[PDB]
Amino acid sequence: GLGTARLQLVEFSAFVEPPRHLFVHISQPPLESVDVRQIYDKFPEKKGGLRELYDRGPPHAFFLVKFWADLNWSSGGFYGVSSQYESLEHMTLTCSSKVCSFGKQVVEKVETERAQLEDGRFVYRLLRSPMCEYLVNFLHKLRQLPERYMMNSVLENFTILQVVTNRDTQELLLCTAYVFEVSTSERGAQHHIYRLVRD
Template sequence: MTHRGWKRIKIQRNTWLFPGRNELIARYIKLRCGKTRTRKQVSSHIQVLARKKMRDEQAKKKVRKSPENSAQRSIEQVKTVVDGIASSKLRLTGFQTLKLDTVIEKYPKLLTELFDRGPPDAFFLAKCWANVSFDSSDTENSLYAVDSYYTSQHKFDISVSTKVCSFGNEVVEKVEVYSPDEENGHYCFRLERSPICEYMVKFISELKKLESRDYMNNVLENFTVLQVVTNQSTGETLMVIGFVFEVNDLPEANCSIFRLVA
């Protein structure tokens, strides 16, 4: 009988068969996640992770050699902090801000098209760290929702398109229209308790089933959200925010925001 993926080891004149590394990893995935992975799939995934680690290390070396070149900095290494997200016609309150250039492959081609049209000061990336170790058993009383607050000196209705993306492709889109309230000479938009889509709720539920934080973050590598805010009447792009996510063990969620540049 042929045992593929097993290694022959000779111990004191006796030959023993032991499962190889990839075979053990495939078995572990089957036990932990209930998913079947072939040895070739495991080997391919290990190679992808190794190449990613090598690229990250090379990028860090480039940053140390040329700190003045902001286009080569990784997201975590950009240091210039802005008070808030704001374009010339709309300001988003409640966030910090920064910039970026290397995540275009994580989003649909729409982001490139919008970026080419501009305005150049309207594009941002938010990297969000979250702790998913919360009790979600009470589904009837649980609410997955988002709060956002904008201010502007101009009066108009805004259309907010939120696209969930997987491997750079749009999976589902939610579109909402909001009218402003006038306060002290400014126009304020309150997007309060806006429920996230059913796809996102199921995604979070499945993500929580993965016991390893590394597995969760590997899944999140290919999961993003793209939010496009436009003038409802004219279709003018007011603000575009891409969201990337990572799981950590801190009790409070954290977010760093970067301005996207060419």
């Protein structure tokens, strides 16, 4: 799973409507591990970078998701992001999304979501969230590249860092690093979740 004893990711998708096609999707063998030092360079060595955050800890909060996104779908159309987390504790969440292009942070989006009681547990729904202009434009350019290897080339410099903290205590609950390639249309979107380690 992508989660800890305290907070667990349930579903994550990015999509276009318009007024659904999913570019990437996580619905929910231990879990392979990746040494965080390998991806230090795909994120800023600045405040709120992978290096900085991992140093505070707890190490078990950190995950890598590699995405093979489906970009086969011209101008619409509702572009959106949906996340759903769950816990057994009642919290409010502060979710920070940092989009990075060549190590540098080009976008940060901070959102807050309160626990909702449902089915003997707390669910945190951040559904139908507008995709920022930057991502829409970027996707619209990327879909036009003639070769999937050129999308892969363009994507090797593009990463997202998602930091979920307990809004009242400032403790870190979940830190997911995203890295990207493209999938074909017959293979469909795919992902591989990893745990980040250092030892």
